[PDB]
């Protein structure tokens, strides 16, 4: 027979859900986005494809914040990412309301994972067309997670998704191999800028705008803040020096 890929939540004879894999195809066509877990925090970075110079620079923000300590970036269908972030914000709000403490990063990851996986159980809904790198600092330290359209999530030393996900990943691994003791927060910021500039080569036809945020226990006091101003320009210059 055939037609197994026409509906969601339908098992193929080899045990696959083809709609989720098509969602992953939709993810891979998205812009590059990475996350680096450092010694006392996490850094998130994303490439914004400047289709034209009519786009107002520094606007059209992609990095989103959940509660005051969780940072989320996603590659794929931007609206699906916004929907997932809204659901995660509701989850964090309910968790804070009931248990007082802000939601831990693994707990939030499982909330998002159950939501995304539930979107693969019925033919009346479409799987999420985003992959999400999120994380932050809780009472147990820094946590970075990546979550797939299937609902699968894992904890990562470093994560990357989008078009330039290959190159980025390689670069990330080099980091993990070169200094296993870890990067500092600002070092991780500059390195994320470098990795986004390097992974932009798979989209070198159009110009891009770098966007970096971070959540560090020492540099941001556990809160999620956009890397802007002098530190952002410093990271951009480090990237320019690393590409040439």
């Amino acid at each position: 027979g055939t037609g197994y890929d026409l509906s969601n939540s339908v098992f193929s004879p080899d045990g696959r859900n083809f709609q989720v894999e098509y969602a992953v195809k939709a993810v891979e066509n998205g812009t590059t986005s990475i996350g680096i877990k450092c010694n006392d925090g996490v850094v998130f970075a994303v490439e914004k494809l400047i289709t034209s110079k009519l786009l107002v620079p520094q606007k059209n923000v992609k990095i989103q914040v959940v509660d005051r300590h969780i940072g989320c970036v996603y590659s794929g269908l931007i609206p699906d990412g916004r929907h997932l972030v809204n659901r995660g914000r509701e989850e964090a709000a309910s968790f804070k309301k009931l248990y007082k403490t802000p939601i831990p990063i693994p707990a939030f990851a499982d909330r998002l994972g159950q939501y995304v996986q539930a979107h693969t159980l019925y033919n009346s809904v479409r799987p999420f067309g985003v992959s999400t790198i999120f994380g932050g600092v809780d009472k147990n330290g820094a946590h970075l997670y990546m979550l797939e359209p299937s609902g699968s999530y894992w904890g990562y030393k470093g994560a990357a998704t989008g078009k330039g996900r290959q190159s980025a990943k390689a670069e990330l691994e080099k980091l993990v191999d070169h200094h296993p003791e870890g990067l500092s927060a600002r070092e991780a910021v500059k390195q994320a800028a470098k990795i986004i500039y390097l992974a932009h080569e798979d989209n070198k036809e159009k110009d891009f705008e770098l966007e970096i945020s971070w959540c560090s226990l020492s540099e941001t006091n556990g809160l999620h803040k956009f890397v802007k101003g002098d530190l952002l320009q410093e990271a951009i210059d480090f990237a320019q020096k690393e590409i040439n």
């Binding site: 019925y122 033919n123 009346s124 809904v125």
Partner: protein, 249 residues
């Protein structure tokens, strides 16, 4: 959301309800289970087909008590039978015992499980149950009775019958071996002999499940002091009793 608000079991142009016939097919591939009604009790038997020898057979109990005087066995898809016995035990209380203070007659509980199965063959977004049941019971005003319930919700009373793979052969045996002067022990013996043909592997107390609806067992009641509380008529035979009755064949 649940967009399956339509029947998944419809009439074909030939008049067949395809899903009901396919559920009956799924039953036909089930392990042989039989029932024989005597004059002083009813017997229901089946084979305890265990997939892995590492699996503990005692947990895989194919005979299930419904009321202290009504038990059940099946042929078909185990899990459907498990959820059906749970629903039957519940409906025995909600629809009868909590209304009349006494457990329901065998025919009424059988009709309730038949109603459940018929709902499964007509409600929206659901397949029929993939099992056929043999219900053996005793009530005060109908005596002992043995009923068979099909995925369609159709139920019929049998003097004796069998369902599953060896159904035809077992039923022929029973037809040529049953009489209205039969005793509970003679019925247990005939049930063992009929199972012996439908079981190719080892044939002992460990591999077969056998239960009876016979006389009341005050020792199985758990309490004494109520002369009207006679005790349960349903009794599952232990492996040792099965072996003792097998050694004398």
């Amino acid at each position: 959301t649940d967009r399956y608000s339509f029947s998944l079991t419809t009439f074909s142009p030939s008049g067949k309800l395809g899903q009901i016939d396919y559920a009956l097919t799924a039953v036909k591939q089930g392990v042989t289970s039989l029932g024989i009604k005597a004059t002083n009790g009813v017997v229901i038997a089946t084979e305890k087909k265990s997939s892995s020898p590492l699996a503990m057979s005692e947990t895989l109990s194919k005979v299930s008590l419904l009321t202290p005087d009504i038990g059940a066995v099946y042929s078909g898809m185990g899990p459907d039978y498990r959820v059906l016995v749970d629903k039957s035990r519940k409906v025995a209380h909600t629809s009868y015992k909590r209304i009349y203070g006494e457990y329901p007659p065998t025919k009424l509980l059988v009709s309730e499980v038949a109603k459940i199965m018929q709902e499964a063959t007509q409600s929206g977004g659901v397949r029929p149950f993939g099992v056929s049941l043999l219900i053996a019971g005793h009530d005060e005003f109908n005596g002992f009775s043995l009923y068979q319930v099909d995925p369609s919700g159709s139920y019929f009373p049998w003097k004796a019958t069998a369902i599953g793979k060896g159904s035809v052969a077992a039923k022929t045996f029973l037809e040529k071996r049953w009489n209205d002067e039969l005793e509970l022990e003679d019925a247990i013996h005939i049930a063992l002999l009929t199972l012996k043909e439908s079981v190719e592997g080892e044939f002992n107390g460990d591999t077969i499940e056998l239960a009876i609806i016979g006389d009341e067992n005050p020792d199985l009641l758990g309490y004494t002091g109520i002369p009207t509380d006679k005790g349960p008529r349903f009794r599952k035979l232990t492996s040792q009793e099965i072996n003792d009755r097998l050694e004398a064949l």
